Ligand binder design. Structure first.
Ligand SMILES: C[N+](C)(C)CCO
Ligand SMILES: C[N+](C)(C)CCO
Ligand SMILES: C[N+](C)(C)CCO
Ligand SMILES: C[N+](C)(C)CCO
Ligand SMILES: C[N+](C)(C)CCO
Ligand SMILES: C[N+](C)(C)CCO
Ligand SMILES: C[N+](C)(C)CCO
Length: 298
């Protein structure tokens, strides 16, 4: 809704001048959208800018006061003629890098040789968060790595937290979200149906597995958890019943799986495990005899 002015080439910059004042920030001119920053220099290419449409950064000229309101910022793409790319779906564009953002008309820089697919929201900003395409989920970065906004809107690869104990996801080499059991850096992780990395005890397909409570990696062998011992086989699955480690027998509780100590009964017969879990065999324990199977013979 800006009219009556004209574009001007001056001082190796581009301005829009109306009645001898310069356009600043966002303007809708002649069916296209432009942005002229804080002093009037028309921008081109990739730009991380305050969002348009509020009025506070819109239809303003440099003779007018500017509200000190700090608006939210997003990525936008402008053509080399300054016109905003008004995309609401997706488009393959030169990759944004450290060398091709925040430039104004007149500044010399090369377009990126590498092109990437960028996704856009209904208001022409680069989209972030989860998107679905061709049978897969991809995550578009919401934040910079851990201030610089460059990563925002890029396709996440590898281990990625989704911030609103934020959930972990793993995206493969093309960005596809993995589900179910996956081996990453030599260790097993379970991502279920939703993609969220499991932690703690998890019942999957009729067996118990323990994933590290913080890191998600599947444990095997003997594990001391919640003041009790459990034995997990090499596949990760929790064992119940009798288990022989070398010559030594252990009994893992039916159901819960915790290792028994002291006197315990299995199918009518009595057994004694020392504090280590080791079954007493062919000896006595406090007056009671136990045979080669560890059974109490009265
Ligand atoms: C990965 N999903 C989009 C299915 C859920 C994340 O909120
Ligand atoms: C990235 N992991 C989820 C594997 C560990 C971080 O604590
Ligand atoms: C070995 N896991 C059971 C952890 C995954 C393969 O099914
Ligand atoms: C039964 N487990 C102890 C293995 C899981 C939590 O109930
Ligand atoms: C079963 N015993 C009698 C051997 C000991 C526990 O009461
Ligand atoms: C860990 N336990 C004490 C249960 C057995 C020794 O490996
Ligand atoms: C002989 N035990 C009772 C110790 C184990 C049989 O599975």
């Amino acid at each position: 809704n800006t009219t009556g002015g004209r574009f001007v080439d001056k001082d190796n910059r581009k301005y829009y001048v109306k009645d001898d004042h310069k356009a600043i920030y966002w303007h809708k001119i002649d069916g296209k959208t432009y942005y002229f920053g804080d002093i009037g220099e028309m921008v081109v290419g990739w730009q991380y800018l305050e969002i348009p449409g509020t009025g506070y950064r819109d239809n303003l000229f440099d003779n007018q006061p500017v509200n000190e309101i700090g608006l939210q910022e997003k990525w936008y793409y402008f053509g080399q003629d300054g016109a905003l790319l008004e995309q609401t779906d997706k488009q393959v564009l030169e990759a944004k890098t450290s060398e091709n953002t925040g430039k104004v008309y007149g500044e010399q820089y090369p377009l990126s040789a590498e092109k990437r697919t960028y996704y856009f929201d209904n208001n022409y900003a680069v989209k972030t968060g989860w998107i679905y395409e061709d049978g897969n989920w991809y995550y578009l970065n919401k934040l910079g790595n851990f201030y610089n906004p460059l990563p925002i809107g890029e396709v996440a690869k590898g281990w990625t937290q989704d911030f609103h104990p934020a959930p972990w996801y793993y995206l493969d080499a093309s960005g596809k979200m993995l589900t179910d059991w996956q081996k990453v850096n030599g260790k097993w992780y379970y991502f279920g149906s939703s993609g969220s990395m499991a932690t703690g005890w998890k019942y999957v397909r009729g067996k118990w597995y323990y994933l590290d409570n913080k890191n998600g990696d599947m444990k095997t062998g003997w594990q001391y958890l919640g003041n009790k011992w459990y034995y997990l086989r090499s596949s990760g699955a929790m064992v119940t019943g009798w288990y022989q480690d070398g010559l030594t027998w252990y009994y893992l509780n039916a159901g819960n799986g915790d290792m028994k100590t002291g006197w315990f009964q299995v199918n009518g017969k009595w057994y004694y495990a020392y504090s280590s879990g080791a079954l007493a065999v062919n000896t006595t324990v406090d007056g009671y005899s136990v045979n080669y199977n560890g059974e109490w013979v009265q």
